[PDB]
Every structure is written in C-alpha cells, then in structure tokens.
PDB file of C-alpha atoms in Angstrom:
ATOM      1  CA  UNK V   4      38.922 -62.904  47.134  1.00  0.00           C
ATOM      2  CA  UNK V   5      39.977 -66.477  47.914  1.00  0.00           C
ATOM      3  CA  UNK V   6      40.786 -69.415  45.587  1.00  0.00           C
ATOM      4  CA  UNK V   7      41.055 -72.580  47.243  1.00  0.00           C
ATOM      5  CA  UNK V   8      38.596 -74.163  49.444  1.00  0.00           C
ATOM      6  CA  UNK V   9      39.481 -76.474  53.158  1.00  0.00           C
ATOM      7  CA  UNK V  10      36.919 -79.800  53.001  1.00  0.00           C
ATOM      8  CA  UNK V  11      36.729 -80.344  56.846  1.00  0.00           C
ATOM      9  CA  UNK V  12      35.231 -83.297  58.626  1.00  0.00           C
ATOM     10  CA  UNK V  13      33.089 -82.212  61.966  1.00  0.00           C
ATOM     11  CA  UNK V  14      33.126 -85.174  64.289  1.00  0.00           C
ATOM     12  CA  UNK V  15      30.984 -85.106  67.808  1.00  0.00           C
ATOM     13  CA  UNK V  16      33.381 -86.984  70.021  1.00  0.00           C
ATOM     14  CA  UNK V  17      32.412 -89.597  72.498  1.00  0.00           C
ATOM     15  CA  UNK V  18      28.832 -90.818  70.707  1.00  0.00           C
ATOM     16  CA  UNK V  19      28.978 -93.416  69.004  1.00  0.00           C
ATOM     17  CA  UNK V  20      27.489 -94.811  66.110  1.00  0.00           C
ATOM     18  CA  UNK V  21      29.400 -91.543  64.744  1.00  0.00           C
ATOM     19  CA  UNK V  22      27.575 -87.739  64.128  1.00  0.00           C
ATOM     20  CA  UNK V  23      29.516 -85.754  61.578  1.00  0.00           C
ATOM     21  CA  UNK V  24      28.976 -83.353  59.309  1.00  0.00           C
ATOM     22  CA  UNK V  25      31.532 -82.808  56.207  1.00  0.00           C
ATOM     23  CA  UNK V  26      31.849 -79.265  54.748  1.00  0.00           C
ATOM     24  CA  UNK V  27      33.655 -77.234  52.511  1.00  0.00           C
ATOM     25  CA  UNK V  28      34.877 -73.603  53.368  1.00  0.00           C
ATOM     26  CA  UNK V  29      37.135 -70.252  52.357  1.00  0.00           C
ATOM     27  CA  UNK V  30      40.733 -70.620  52.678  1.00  0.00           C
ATOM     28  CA  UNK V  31      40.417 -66.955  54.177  1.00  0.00           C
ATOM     29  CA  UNK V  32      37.839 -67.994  56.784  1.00  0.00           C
ATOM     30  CA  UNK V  33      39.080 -67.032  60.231  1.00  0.00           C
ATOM     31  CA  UNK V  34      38.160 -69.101  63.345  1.00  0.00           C
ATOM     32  CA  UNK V  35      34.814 -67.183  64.049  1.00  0.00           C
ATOM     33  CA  UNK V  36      33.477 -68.083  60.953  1.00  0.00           C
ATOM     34  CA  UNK V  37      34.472 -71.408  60.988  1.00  0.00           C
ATOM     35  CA  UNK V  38      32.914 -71.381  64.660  1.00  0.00           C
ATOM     36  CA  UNK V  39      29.880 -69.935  62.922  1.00  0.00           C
ATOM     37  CA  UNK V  40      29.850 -72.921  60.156  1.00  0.00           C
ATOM     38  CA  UNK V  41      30.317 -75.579  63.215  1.00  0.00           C
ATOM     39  CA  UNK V  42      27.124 -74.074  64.750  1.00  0.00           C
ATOM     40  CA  UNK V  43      25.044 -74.311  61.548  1.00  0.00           C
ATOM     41  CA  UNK V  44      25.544 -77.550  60.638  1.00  0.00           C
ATOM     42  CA  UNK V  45      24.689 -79.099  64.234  1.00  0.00           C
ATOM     43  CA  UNK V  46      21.631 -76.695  64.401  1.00  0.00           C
ATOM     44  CA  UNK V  47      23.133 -74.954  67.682  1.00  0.00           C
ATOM     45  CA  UNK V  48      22.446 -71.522  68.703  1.00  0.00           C
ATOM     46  CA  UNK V  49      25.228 -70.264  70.581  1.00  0.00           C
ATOM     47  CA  UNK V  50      24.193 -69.752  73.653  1.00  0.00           C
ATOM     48  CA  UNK V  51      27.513 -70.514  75.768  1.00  0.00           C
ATOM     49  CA  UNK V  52      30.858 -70.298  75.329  1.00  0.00           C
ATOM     50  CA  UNK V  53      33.156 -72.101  72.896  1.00  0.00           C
ATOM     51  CA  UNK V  54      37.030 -72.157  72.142  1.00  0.00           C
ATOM     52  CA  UNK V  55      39.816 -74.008  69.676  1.00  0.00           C
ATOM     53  CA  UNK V  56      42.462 -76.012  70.693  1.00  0.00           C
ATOM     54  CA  UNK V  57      45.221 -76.170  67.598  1.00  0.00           C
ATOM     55  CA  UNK V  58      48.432 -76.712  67.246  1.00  0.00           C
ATOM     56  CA  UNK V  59      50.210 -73.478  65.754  1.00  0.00           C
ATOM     57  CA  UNK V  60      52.372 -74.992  63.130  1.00  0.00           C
ATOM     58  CA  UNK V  61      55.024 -72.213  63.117  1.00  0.00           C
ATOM     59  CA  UNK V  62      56.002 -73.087  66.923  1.00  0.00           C
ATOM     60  CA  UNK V  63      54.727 -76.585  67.530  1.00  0.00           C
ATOM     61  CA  UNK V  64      52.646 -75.380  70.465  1.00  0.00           C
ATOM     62  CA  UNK V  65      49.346 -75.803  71.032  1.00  0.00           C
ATOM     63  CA  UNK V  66      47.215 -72.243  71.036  1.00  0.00           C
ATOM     64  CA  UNK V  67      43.461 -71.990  72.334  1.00  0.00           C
ATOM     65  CA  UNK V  68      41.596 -69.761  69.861  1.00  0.00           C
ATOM     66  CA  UNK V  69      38.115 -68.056  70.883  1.00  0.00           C
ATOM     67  CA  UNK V  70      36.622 -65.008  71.339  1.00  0.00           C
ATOM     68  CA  UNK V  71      38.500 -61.352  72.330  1.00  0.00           C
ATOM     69  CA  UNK V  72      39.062 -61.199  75.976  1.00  0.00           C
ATOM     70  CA  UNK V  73      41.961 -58.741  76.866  1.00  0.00           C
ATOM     71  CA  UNK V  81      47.318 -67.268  76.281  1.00  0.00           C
ATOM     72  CA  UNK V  82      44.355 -66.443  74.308  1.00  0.00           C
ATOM     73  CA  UNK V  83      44.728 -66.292  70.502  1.00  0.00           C
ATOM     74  CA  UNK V  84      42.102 -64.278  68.959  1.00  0.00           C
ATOM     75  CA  UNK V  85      39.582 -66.338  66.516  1.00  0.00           C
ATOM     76  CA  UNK V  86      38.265 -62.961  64.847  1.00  0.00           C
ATOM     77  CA  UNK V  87      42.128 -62.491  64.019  1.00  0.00           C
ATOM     78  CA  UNK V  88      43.044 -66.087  63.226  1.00  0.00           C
ATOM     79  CA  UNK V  89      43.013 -67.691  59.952  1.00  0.00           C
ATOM     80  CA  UNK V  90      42.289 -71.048  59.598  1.00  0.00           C
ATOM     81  CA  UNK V  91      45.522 -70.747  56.516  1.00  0.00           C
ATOM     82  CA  UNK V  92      47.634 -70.046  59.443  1.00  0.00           C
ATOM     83  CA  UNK V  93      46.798 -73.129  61.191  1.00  0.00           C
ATOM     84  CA  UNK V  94      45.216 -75.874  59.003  1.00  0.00           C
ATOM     85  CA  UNK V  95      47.799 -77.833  56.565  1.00  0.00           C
ATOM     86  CA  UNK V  96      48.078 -81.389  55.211  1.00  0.00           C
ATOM     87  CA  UNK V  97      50.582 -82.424  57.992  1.00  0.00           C
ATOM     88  CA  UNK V  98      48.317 -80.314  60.363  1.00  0.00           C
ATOM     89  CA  UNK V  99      44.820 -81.511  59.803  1.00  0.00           C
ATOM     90  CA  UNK V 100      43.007 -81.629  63.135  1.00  0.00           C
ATOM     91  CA  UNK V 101      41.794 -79.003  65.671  1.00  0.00           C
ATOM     92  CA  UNK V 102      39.776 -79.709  68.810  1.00  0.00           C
ATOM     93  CA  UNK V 103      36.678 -77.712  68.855  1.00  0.00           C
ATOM     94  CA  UNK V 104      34.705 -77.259  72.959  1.00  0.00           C
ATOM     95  CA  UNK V 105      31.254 -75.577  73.176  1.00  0.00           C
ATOM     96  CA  UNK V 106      29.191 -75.542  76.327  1.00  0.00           C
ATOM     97  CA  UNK V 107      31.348 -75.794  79.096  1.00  0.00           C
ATOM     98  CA  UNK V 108      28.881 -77.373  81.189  1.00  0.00           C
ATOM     99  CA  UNK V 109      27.882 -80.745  78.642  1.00  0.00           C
ATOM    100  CA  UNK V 110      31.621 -80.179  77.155  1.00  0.00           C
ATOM    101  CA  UNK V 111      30.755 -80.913  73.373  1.00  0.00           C
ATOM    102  CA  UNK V 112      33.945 -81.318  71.718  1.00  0.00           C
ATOM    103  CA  UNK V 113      34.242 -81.785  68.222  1.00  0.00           C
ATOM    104  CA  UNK V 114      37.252 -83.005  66.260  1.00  0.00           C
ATOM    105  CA  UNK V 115      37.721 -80.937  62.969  1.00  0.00           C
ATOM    106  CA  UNK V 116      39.924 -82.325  60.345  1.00  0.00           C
ATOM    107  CA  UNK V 117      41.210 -80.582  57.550  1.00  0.00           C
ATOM    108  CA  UNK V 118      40.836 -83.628  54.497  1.00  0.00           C
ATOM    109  CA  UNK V 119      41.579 -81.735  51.204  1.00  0.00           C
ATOM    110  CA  UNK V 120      42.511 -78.264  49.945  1.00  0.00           C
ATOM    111  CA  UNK V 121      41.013 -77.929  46.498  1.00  0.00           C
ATOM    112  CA  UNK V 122      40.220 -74.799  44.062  1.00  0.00           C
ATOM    113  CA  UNK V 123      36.591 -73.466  44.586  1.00  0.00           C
ATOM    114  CA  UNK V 124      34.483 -74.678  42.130  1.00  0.00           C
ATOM    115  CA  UNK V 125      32.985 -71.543  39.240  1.00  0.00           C
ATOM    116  CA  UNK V 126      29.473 -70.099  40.490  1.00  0.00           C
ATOM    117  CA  UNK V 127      29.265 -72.891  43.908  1.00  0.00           C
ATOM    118  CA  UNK V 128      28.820 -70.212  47.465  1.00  0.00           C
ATOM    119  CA  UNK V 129      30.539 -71.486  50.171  1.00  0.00           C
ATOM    120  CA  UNK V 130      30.376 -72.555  53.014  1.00  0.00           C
ATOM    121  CA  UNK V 131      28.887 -75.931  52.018  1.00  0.00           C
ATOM    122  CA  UNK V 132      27.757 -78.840  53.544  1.00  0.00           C
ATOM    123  CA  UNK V 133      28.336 -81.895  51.324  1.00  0.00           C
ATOM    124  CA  UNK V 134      27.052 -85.092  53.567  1.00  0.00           C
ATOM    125  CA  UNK V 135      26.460 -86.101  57.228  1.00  0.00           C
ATOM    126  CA  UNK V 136      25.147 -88.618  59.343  1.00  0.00           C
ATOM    127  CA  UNK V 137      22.882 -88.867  62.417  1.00  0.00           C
ATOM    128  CA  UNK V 138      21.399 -85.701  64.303  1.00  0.00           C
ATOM    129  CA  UNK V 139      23.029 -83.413  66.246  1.00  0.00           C
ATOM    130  CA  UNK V 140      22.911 -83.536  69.728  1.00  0.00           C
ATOM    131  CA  UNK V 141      20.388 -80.512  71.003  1.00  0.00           C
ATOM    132  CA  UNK V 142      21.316 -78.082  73.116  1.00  0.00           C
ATOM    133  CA  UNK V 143      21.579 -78.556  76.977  1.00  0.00           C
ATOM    134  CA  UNK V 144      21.223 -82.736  76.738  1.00  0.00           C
ATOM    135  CA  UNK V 145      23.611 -83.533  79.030  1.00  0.00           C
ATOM    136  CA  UNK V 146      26.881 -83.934  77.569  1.00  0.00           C
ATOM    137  CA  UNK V 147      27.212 -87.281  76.369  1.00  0.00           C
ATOM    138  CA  UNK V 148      26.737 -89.019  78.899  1.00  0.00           C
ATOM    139  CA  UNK V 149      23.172 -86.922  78.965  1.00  0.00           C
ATOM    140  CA  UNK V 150      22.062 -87.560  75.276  1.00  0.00           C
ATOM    141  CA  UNK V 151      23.074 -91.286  75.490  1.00  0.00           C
ATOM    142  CA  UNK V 152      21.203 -91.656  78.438  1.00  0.00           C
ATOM    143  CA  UNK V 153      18.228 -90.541  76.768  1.00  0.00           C
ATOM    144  CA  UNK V 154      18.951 -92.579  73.544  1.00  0.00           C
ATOM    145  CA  UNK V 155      18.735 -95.497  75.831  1.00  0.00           C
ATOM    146  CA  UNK V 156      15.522 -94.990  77.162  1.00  0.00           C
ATOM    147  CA  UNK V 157      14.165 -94.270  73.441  1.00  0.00           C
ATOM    148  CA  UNK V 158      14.443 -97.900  73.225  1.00  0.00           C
ATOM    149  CA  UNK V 159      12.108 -98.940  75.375  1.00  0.00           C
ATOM    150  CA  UNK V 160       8.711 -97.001  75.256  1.00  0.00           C
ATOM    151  CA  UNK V 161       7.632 -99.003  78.692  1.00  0.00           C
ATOM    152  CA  UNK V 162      10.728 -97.329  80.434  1.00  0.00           C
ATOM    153  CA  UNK V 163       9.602 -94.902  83.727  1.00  0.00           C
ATOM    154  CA  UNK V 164      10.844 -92.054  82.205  1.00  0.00           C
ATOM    155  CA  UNK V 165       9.843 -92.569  78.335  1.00  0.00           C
ATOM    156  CA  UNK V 166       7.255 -89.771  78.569  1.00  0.00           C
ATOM    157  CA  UNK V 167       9.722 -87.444  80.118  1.00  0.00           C
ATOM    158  CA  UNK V 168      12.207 -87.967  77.681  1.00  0.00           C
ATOM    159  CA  UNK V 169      10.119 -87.675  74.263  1.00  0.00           C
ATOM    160  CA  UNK V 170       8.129 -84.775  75.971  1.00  0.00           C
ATOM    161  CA  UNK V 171      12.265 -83.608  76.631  1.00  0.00           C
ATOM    162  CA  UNK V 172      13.299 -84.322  72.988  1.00  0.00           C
ATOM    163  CA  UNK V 173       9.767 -83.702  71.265  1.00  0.00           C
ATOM    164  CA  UNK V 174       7.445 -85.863  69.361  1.00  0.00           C
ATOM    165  CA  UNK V 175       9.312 -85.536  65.595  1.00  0.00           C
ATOM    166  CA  UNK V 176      12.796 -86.039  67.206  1.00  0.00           C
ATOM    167  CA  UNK V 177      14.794 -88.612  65.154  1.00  0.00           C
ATOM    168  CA  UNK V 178      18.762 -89.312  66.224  1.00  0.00           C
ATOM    169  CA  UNK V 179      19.068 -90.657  62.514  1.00  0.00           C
ATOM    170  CA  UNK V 180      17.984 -87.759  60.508  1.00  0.00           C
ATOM    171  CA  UNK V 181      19.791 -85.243  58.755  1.00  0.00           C
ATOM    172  CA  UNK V 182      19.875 -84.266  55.375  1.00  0.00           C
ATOM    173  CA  UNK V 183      22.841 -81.729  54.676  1.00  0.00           C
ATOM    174  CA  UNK V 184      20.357 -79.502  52.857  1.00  0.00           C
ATOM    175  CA  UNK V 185      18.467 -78.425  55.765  1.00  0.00           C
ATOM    176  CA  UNK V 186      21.844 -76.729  56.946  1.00  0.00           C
ATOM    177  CA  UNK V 187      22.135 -72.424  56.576  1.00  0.00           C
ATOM    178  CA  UNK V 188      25.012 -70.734  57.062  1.00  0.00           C
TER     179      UNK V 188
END
C-alpha cells in the first residue's frame, strides 16, 4: 500500500552538542503519524499541543499543519507526499508551547522499502531526549550545567528532578516503539 520510504533527520534545535534521531517512514504517512513517530523516538507523551510549519510546495507559502480545529491545514488530512520533496526537505516541528521544543525535520532520501523491514524505523541517534516539562532549553541546559558539578546548591534538586539513572548521552535507537 506504499512503495517508497522518506529517511528523515529529527533535530532538537537550540541544544547543542546536537540530539537527533534519524528514521525511516511511509511515503503515505500523513502529518499525525509522522507527529506520532516524532513523539516515539524522543520518548514524549503528548501531553500538550504541537503543530508543523512547512512550506506547501504547490504555492510557495508556508502552511501550519496540526490537529482539526474548525489558516489551519489539517495533519490527519495532510500527506507528508504533498509536502516533503528533494528541493523541499525541511519542516519545522513545535511541541509544548510553554518550553517551545522545536524540531527541524529534514527529508534526506526517498528510497524503495526494503522486502519484509516494518516501518517506521529508527536507524541511529545521538544523545537523550530532552524530558518532558524541563524548561525549554534554556531549562534542560540549565540543569546540564549543574550536572557538572555535584557540589553545586542545587545538585540534589536537579538529579532528584531528572532521576538517579538519567544519562544526556544515552540512547540506543532500539529502545524506540512506534
């Protein structure tokens, strides 16, 4: 019911060394399931609201894509084959708009799905994702910063805030579900 897959780089904007995820989905995938796949791989639960900002490439303008309200494209409608091409790569992805995570999605290769493989996939990544309600960037930096120093005033606060196994470095793309 689809042949070729979208490989898509996931990019949390404004942290830096870099967390990204890369993954490979449907071309038939509309916008809610791609805003599904974005949730897996950072381990979010959607718990607030989220939208797409795109440019449509059959008028040049950008359209915000997210969920039905009654200016508003609809993501259940949307395809991501309407909107995603090789000179029309990148979308701008906002969840949470109180911390304002943003992630940059890039479309890096169209390719045939592979015999027997189920999609979506996630092939690599790097770092953790941010959890929920940290702040923003500014917010999960912040604590990132204190990590470093264990004799900091609010050290306790933060691990107790994180928890004890928290690790920004670790991810393995095989603990992601879709």
């Amino acid at each position: 019911t689809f042949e070729k897959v979208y490989h898509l780089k996931l990019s949390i904007k404004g942290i830096t060394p870099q967390i990204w995820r890369r993954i490979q989905v449907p071309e038939n995938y509309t916008f809610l399931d791609l805003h599904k796949a974005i949730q897996a791989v950072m381990d979010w639960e959607d718990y607030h609201l989220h939208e797409f900002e795109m440019v449509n490439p059959k008028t040049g303008m950008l359209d915000k894509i997210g969920a039905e309200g009654d200016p508003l494209v609809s993501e259940k409608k949307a395809k991501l084959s309407d909107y995603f091409t090789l000179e029309n790569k990148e979308a701008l992805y906002t969840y949470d708009f109180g911390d304002n995570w943003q992630v940059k999605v890039r479309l890096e290769k169209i390719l045939p799905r592979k015999e027997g493989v189920e999609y979506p996939i996630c092939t690599a990544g790097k770092r953790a994702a941010v959890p929920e309600d940290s702040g923003g960037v500014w917010g999960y930096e912040e604590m990132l910063e204190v990590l470093k120093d264990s004799e900091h005033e609010e050290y306790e606060d933060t691990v107790l805030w994180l928890g004890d196994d928290f690790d920004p470095e670790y991810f393995d793309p095989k603990d992601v579900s879709f």
